[PDB]
Amino acid sequence: CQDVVQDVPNVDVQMLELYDRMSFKDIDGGVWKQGWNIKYDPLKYNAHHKLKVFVVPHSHNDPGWIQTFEEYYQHDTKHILSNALRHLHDNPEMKFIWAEISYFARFYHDLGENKKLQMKSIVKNGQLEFVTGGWVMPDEANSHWRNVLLQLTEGQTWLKQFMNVTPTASWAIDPFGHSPTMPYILQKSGFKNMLIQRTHYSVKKELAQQRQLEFLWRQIWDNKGDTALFTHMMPFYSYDIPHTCGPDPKVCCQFDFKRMGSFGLSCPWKVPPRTISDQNVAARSDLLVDQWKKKAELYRTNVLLIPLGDDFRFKQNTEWDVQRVNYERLFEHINSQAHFNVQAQFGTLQEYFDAVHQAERAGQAEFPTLSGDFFTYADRSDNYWSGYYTSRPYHKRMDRVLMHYVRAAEMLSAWHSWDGMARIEERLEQARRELSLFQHHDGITGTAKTHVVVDYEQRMQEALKACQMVMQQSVYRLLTKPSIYSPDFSFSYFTLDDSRWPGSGVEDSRTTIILGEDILPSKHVVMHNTLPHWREQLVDFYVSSPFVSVTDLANNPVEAQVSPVWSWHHDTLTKTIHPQGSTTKYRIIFKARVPPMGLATYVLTISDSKPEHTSYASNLLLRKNPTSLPLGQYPEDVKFGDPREISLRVGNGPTLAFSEQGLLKSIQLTQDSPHVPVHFKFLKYGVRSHGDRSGAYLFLPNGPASPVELGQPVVLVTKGKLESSVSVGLPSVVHQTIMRGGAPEIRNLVDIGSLDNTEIVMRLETHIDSGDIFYTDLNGLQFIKRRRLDKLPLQANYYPIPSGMFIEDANTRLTLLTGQPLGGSSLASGELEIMQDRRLASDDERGLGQGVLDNKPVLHIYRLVLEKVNNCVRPSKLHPAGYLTSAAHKASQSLLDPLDKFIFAENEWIGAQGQFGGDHPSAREDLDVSVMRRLTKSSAKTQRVGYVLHRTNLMQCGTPEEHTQKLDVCHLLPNVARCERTTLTFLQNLEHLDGMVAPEVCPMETAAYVSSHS
């Protein structure tokens, strides 16, 4: 295994180093506004060295944006695809590329057999070529790598089954900034090439000058280069026609033949296209070849890529004809005029890359190596696209909840083959497709119109219901005596209970377990642990009595703690945000212990008085002029007091001190260590009154944030043996800090209400001497070093926080893990900040045509980990990566893949069993089984199960930790007949494995395996 910490890769372009050196000046470069006047030597190309030009027709189809997926399919995409089939069928030389398989699958299943055969034929013959082949062209900032893989696999599996092709070239022309998580996943899925477009205009200028727009993109920690993927970055401001033929859009616009009038499009540079004729073809060719030779100067080979397309293009039959015929006249003239020394033709993306690599092999060019990312994107001036790292945060959190539910439903049901009548495959396909659809660059990004966000939400809601159904049917089968098991596939044996989604104050959706001496004395509950190691986690349920005790299935008592059910309300009468305690239901908390990738059953039993193994939390309401808070049957009385500073310690854990405002002030790791200053503060950013305004994409603050005026907030302290917490009602946020013995958990119920032009940020102030350095993650996969640059505006120093961020100095580190992607930064030494929500009354001029005024309450979750790191083996000062400690990685897993909770729905569960998975190996803590998926239906003689294994890299800080089992996924199911290593999409076998044993993977590597069973 390659060492991912100690060896700094040597690459030609390292983006953090490039950023440090670049000036970022925004000067007028002439017709190429963000570049310069390109010059070329006319004698560079000659009879023996011609410029080969591939014009690649394309149509960008968003699976939701200004319209929903179904509306665009009906109004535009079904017509684009129908006319592409007709025109390519009838014109053998025409070519077209297609990226979004969600739309293609939607179209193809509606075709009659004759058209299906014609479509398969134009794909097999090379006229229609799929690029990437994912369900969508995903966002690359907020998406979790697991869901980027999920959507890629969904579209590619559809393509292999129905079109018999697997793309090896990727096309990503619209995501707003680009992540190296894409070449990481693509290179492990069979890809050989990829293309990107939206990168900072200063980066396009810098790389163009050095002819570094084509490069071998490797991961930041990859010293050898085995992760490298050839990448082509487009050079100009847009992928539309005006910005794809060359540096001068006033000339290129004249070669978009859809802009002459009858289509309602025109050229903003004031010169329209004109039909190509024998009388003007020479002058037009002179102009066009000149743009092509200028564009060719920015690259190293004699093979030139000219995309020809835009959004929802190639719709009208007349549009196909006007583009095809005018370009064929230009090609016939250019190709026949020897003095141009050009050979131009329609082509596909693969054809372009194949030609480039043939030139490389002929020794005509060598390409630079590059590592890093392409965030944060700006398309012009100071317009940095950091707003969408936070826009529509409710759905960004929903994305992560569904991410986990899909994983759990696929894993729980993978253990057995199911009868078709159980509709397991059907429900899982729907869940995977709706989550895949939401990875679109206008889905999770929060950049769609209001009614479209509504459509994505409704789809995800159904996806969660489908997961619940599969999970609960699986638990009943996994824990019921086989000879007693008698399923009704439509019945609900268990209901899922989720403490953090939609969350308290967001939706009262949680059921109360109703017990009573005269009705039902006890209830079975079951926890699932999707991770491959034994795991303990406190779990909570709502119960109708405070007098409840817990036992495991050996009837062994389990220590529990009971607390009140607290809800916060804005009292429009008193004008205070204060908690109300339930007088009809309570919370029981206990530690569940669950096997690796398994299940554990516990029982809740009611009694008439305090049970021996159940304790009760004390409660203290701090506020001036308090009023009583009765708690129905709850034993202990609530106490009151004026606001004051407070300290709490659960177990052996850290001791947290809080201000009289209920916000963290310090953390003391051990009883004798110092109280390290760690202060939570909430502030707000506004919007500019003159000049460009923030919108769904853009973050354009009117200066540094200002403190939220807190007044005298109401603070609630609940102190328990197992769990304690301090909650405070602040304007727009009920902020809660929970302690269970280790790193605290933070929960924010964010309701921005009607505060227009406001962005609420949560900041952490410390005295850590981080300087201008901080770390953020990319897609939940890796942590990358960031350097705050005062030469760039505040919004440029904002980065995606898809799962976590940290700052450190030589001795101390503070890491904030998230249960949802949000935007954040470190704008001064010792600070961390992350945006909670943003409400914007104006549009930001990118075409969305609306502000963001559809905010809804969302519960954001976090883990805050303060730790000493003077003893950790960290990368050197020049290394571009960072790595989490064991505690921080487990803290991240607790937010993203918590234990799942099931409540038996009937009175009695006959045949109940206590545990499932006790014999599963408990793998090393840095290893995860990211995906477990049965790939075959029940009628298959040979069953196949696929696994994606991922190993992260954790810092070595002096903790021995050495007692775990080797995990061989191929032997998790019995009767294994074969084990193969495959691409990550499971579509190609790469290695027949000896002994039918699946090796574990190296730190930072991800592998896939498929076991076959007879």
Ligand SMILES: *[C@@H]1O[C@H](CO)[C@@H](O)[C@H](O)[C@H]1NC(C)=O
């Ligand atoms: C699928 O594609 C491969 C590669 O061209 C071809 O050999 C095969 O015959 C095609 N059809 C089948 C059998 O799926």
Ligand SMILES: CS[C@@H]1[C@@H](N)[C@@H](O)[C@@H](O)[C@H]1O
């Ligand atoms: C140019 S804005 C961008 C448009 N290109 C459209 O495809 C959609 O994804 C939107 O967010």
Ligand SMILES: [Zn+2]
């Ligand atoms: Zn788009």
